[PDB]
Design a protein around this ligand. Structure first.
Ligand SMILES: OC[C@H]1O[C@@H](O[C@@H]2[C@H](O)[C@@H](O)[C@H](O[C@@H]3[C@H](O)[C@@H](O)[C@H](O)O[C@@H]3CO)O[C@@H]2CO)[C@H](O)[C@@H](O)[C@H]1O
Ligand SMILES: [Ca+2]
Length: 386
């Protein structure tokens, strides 16, 4: 019963990706996924059959405390990145390695240096960052992973690896980029920023990147309709960067709520009072949103290479009523967004908010691992629904 109006002018090699970084922690938590038919099956194979052709994976340097207690959020480190890559490549999907260059969540307010770089002079940190990237890529290559793109930083709107000075950030961006270039010329180098509604931000950032000679190919943007303004604006600011700097552009993160119900007992990110919700909070609504962002990026023209849906499967480890038994899993396997063990690294945020999934209601699978009809959006954008 799912409807999807054909996206206009959609290039056929358009990147249709998903970031399922939490898949490992979730699977270790006993969560399982199925397919249309209803039979237990590797999520990566279901994704492939759904038309997905790219997988994004976040990577934290050392997402653990001194004792080896994962910080949660999927406890995404190089090792899991390799497990995800191997499976992604095994299912004919390229990989986007997302380096946060931090031990935990890296966003507009958090860009903490990895503990190992905690007190290194800038010069040594810069070479550390390059070394890490270099070795991490090399490890992936050895595992036979098909790396199509690398993200040097995640939503680095105001910082990267403990640095906030753009001159230093650019040098770090370049250090990271350098490692990619030395690894494989075909790998696209992407920089990721967010909050495209902010007047002039992207224009200012692209110029700064220019002024400091940052070597990158993709100007990536996050896009959550409930905070990031209009689709008209997204297309506009991205088209400006593409045209002005000759960069490719894409949406590295996007999603939408298919239900207002919190499935595991941990307050969800959306929907909330005040957020913009142009599409109904339903499966069709979610599909409309995904299809619209794809349209928006495609409207950039030749430079709009794709859209990655962020966490389409961060479903509940258990029902909302087992809240306490759920916490046990979130804590043991880090299958929640954060564990109490991350209080050290991130005292203010993770410290007082740790728990489970904050986006289970934004997945493309139901709380039981069964795909929602909206998962069909990746295929239907090319043709439309009969
Ligand atoms: O759970 C109910 C409350 O959640 C709060 O959100 C918390 C953090 O404030 C928020 O930053 C964090 O988000 C994670 C990460 O930091 C972010 O960069 C990434 O994009 O998403 C992660 C989770 O998906 O999530 C926790 C717990 O939700 C809200 O701020 C609060 O209003 C309320 O909803
Ligand atoms: Ca939840």
């Amino acid at each position: 019963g799912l409807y999807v109006e054909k996206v206009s002018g959609l290039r056929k090699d358009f990147i249709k990706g998903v970031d399922v970084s939490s898949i490992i922690a979730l699977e270790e938590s006993g969560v399982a996924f199925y397919n249309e038919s209803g039979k237990k099956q590797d999520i990566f194979k279901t994704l492939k059959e759904a038309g997905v052709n790219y997988v994004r994976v976040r990577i934290w340097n050392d997402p653990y405390d001194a004792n080896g207690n994962g910080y949660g959020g999927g406890n995404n480190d190089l090792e899991k990145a390799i497990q995800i890559g191997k499976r992604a490549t095994a299912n004919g999907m390229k990989l986007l390695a997302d380096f946060h260059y931090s031990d935990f969540w890296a966003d507009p307010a958090k860009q903490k240096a990895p503990k190992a770089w905690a007190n290194l002079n800038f010069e040594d940190k810069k070479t550390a960052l390059y070394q890490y990237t270099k070795q991490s890529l090399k490890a992936m290559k050895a595992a036979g992973i098909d790396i199509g793109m690398v993200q040097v930083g995640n939503e680095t709107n105001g910082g990267l690896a403990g640095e906030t000075d753009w001159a230093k950030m650019s040098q770090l961006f370049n250090a990271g980029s350098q490692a990619v270039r030395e690894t494989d010329s075909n790998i696209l180098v992407a920089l990721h920023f967010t909050n495209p509604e902010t007047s002039g931000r992207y224009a200012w950032i692209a110029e700064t990147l220019h002024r400091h000679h940052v070597d990158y190919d993709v100007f990536a943007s996050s896009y959550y309709p409930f905070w990031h303004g209009t689709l008209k604006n997204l297309t506009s600011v991205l088209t400006s960067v593409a045209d002005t700097y000759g960069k490719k552009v894409m949406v590295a993160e996007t999603s939408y709520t298919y239900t207002a119900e919190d499935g595991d007992g941990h307050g969800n990110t959306a929907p909330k009072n005040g957020q913009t919700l142009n599409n109904p909070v339903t499966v069709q609504g979610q599909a409309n949103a995904v299809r619209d962002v794809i349209q928006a990026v495609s409207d950039v023209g030749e430079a709009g290479i794709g859209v990655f849906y962020w966490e389409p499967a961060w479903i509940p480890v258990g029902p909302a009523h087992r809240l306490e038994k759920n916490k046990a899993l979130w804590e043991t396997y880090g299958s929640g967004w954060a564990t109490s063990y991350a209080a050290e690294y991130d005292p203010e945020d993770a410290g007082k908010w740790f728990g489970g999934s904050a986006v289970d209601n934004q997945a493309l699978f139901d709380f039981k691992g069964r795909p929602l009809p909206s998962l069909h959006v990746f295929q239907y954008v090319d043709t439309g629904t009969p």
